[PDB]
Scaffold this active site. Structure first.
Site: not given
Length: 162
Positions: A11, A20
């Site tokens: 991440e 994202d």
């Protein structure tokens, strides 16, 4: 290696609001703020999450706090999920981390799509599970990350993370 180090690799850590892989406003270690295209809505969600006026920026401590909450919520979600819990509880510790990782990334809305993968995981048909898991939007959209998670499910080792 552990679930925290694993998700930190997958991440990353960014202290300013970013989008994202799906284009959604996010901060920290993959903390999704909102699916709204409105940056202001994301900033509101951030301030609510942190409890202060962040103006789109957080500290490392704040990111790690969100991450702790998010990892905890992912596992607790799995344990509340009638389809996921028996599969998860059938797994060894390393494969459980792959399950946490997958839910962290994907949430639970697509669990029914993974019925066949989940059956194979519970059956410990590891290579079959891994082949099935890769036949997914998940794999095609984030293949390098999905390859790591799938290798983890396939082997129950940390080889994909070094």
């Amino acid at each position: 290696m552990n679930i925290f180090e694993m998700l930190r690799i997958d991440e990353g850590l960014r202290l300013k609001i970013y989008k994202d892989t799906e284009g959604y406003y996010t901060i920290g270690i993959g903390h999704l703020l909102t699916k709204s295209p409105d940056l202001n809505a994301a900033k509101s969600e951030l301030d609510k999450a942190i409890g202060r006026n962040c103006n789109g920026v957080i500290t490392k401590d704040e990111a790690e706090k969100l991450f702790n909450q998010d990892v905890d919520a992912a596992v607790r979600g799995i344990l509340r999920n009638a389809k996921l819990k028996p599969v998860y509880d059938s797994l060894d510790a390393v494969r459980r981390c792959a399950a946490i990782n997958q839910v962290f990334q994907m949430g639970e809305t697509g669990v029914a799509g993974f019925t066949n993968s989940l059956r194979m995981l519970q059956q410990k048909r590891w290579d079959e599970a891994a082949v099935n898991l890769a036949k997914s939007r998940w794999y095609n959209q984030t293949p390098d990350r999905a390859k790591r998670v799938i290798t983890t499910f396939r082997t129950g080792t940390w080889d994909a993370y070094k």
